[PDB]
Amino acid sequence: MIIPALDLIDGTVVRLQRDYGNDPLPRLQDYAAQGAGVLHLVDLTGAKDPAKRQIPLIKTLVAGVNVPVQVGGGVRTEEDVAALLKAGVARVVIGSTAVKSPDVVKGWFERFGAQALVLALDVRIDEHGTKQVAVSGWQENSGVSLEQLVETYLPVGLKHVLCTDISGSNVSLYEEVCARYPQIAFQSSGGIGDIDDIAALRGTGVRGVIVGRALLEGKFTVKEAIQCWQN
Numbered sequence: 181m182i183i184p185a186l187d188l189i190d191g192t193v194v195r196l197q198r199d200y201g202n203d204p205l206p207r208l209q210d211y212a213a214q215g216a217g218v219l220h221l222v223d224l225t226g227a228k229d230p231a232k233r234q235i236p237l238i239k240t241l242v243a244g245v246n247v248p249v250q251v252g253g254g255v256r257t258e259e260d261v262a263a264l265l266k267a268g269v270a271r272v273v274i275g276s277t278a279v280k281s282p283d284v285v286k287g288w289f290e291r292f293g294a295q296a297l298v299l300a301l302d303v304r305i306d307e308h309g310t311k312q313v314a315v316s317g318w319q320e321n322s323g324v325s326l327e328q329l330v331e332t333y334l335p336v337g338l339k340h341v342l343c344t345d346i347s348g349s350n351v352s353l354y355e356e357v358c359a360r361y362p363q364i365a366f367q368s369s370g371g372i373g374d375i376d377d378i379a380a381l382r383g384t385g386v387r388g389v390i391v392g393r394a395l396l397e398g399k400f401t402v403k404e405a406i407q408c409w410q411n
């Protein structure tokens with residue numbers, strides 16, 4: 181499915197920074213009105229300081245649409261996961277903590293269930309052609325491959341992985357990992373500049389396609405994206 185996405189800073193919709201206004205709820209409602217079955221939010225305020233996690237806003241947004249929302253941004257602790265779920269989010273998106281503390285995160289899978297968690301991994305293809313995991317675009321590689329990290333979590337029932345390519349190559353990347361782990365539903369993130377980019381991901385095996393900036397830029401609509409995806 182198409183997964184429309186917003187990044188939020190202090191109640192403001194931003195592009196990665198350009199301000200697109202303070203109306204995230206009507207934006208999300210219109211995404212759902214066009215047929216979206218899942219939405220994605222990044223709490224950039226929470227990511228910079230978990231003390232200022234935008235829980236009240238997230239509550240309002242989840243309540244205001246009829247579809248599951250997955251939410252990430254500075255999820256560091258079990259308390260963070262619980263607080264987001266309590267606010268009504270469908271799934272919590274875990275990023276750097278899934279790389280840095282796998283035994284701790286494996287415990288979260290046991291407590292909350294695999295249906296409640298999405299692991300978001302940034303992947304950089306190195307000189308050798310290895311899929312290297314990094315915790316962000318501006319930090320060096322972490323010394324573990326995508327495959328190695330996925331296999332760390334398969335024993336606790338990993339089901340959802342969001343993969344962002346931060347290094348043609350894009351499509352091959354998703355074809356390979358989806359083929360290797362058909363029991364995992366992979367989501368693609370990044371590299372969607374126009375409608376043809378969505379077409380290209382078709383048949384790769386990816387289950388979900390995150391689309392953020394291209395919608396804000398008015399390149400195409402959620403309805404058009406879904407029609408392309410469904411072919």
Ligand code: NA
Pocket residue numbers: 185186187194195391392393396
């Ligand atoms: Na966005």
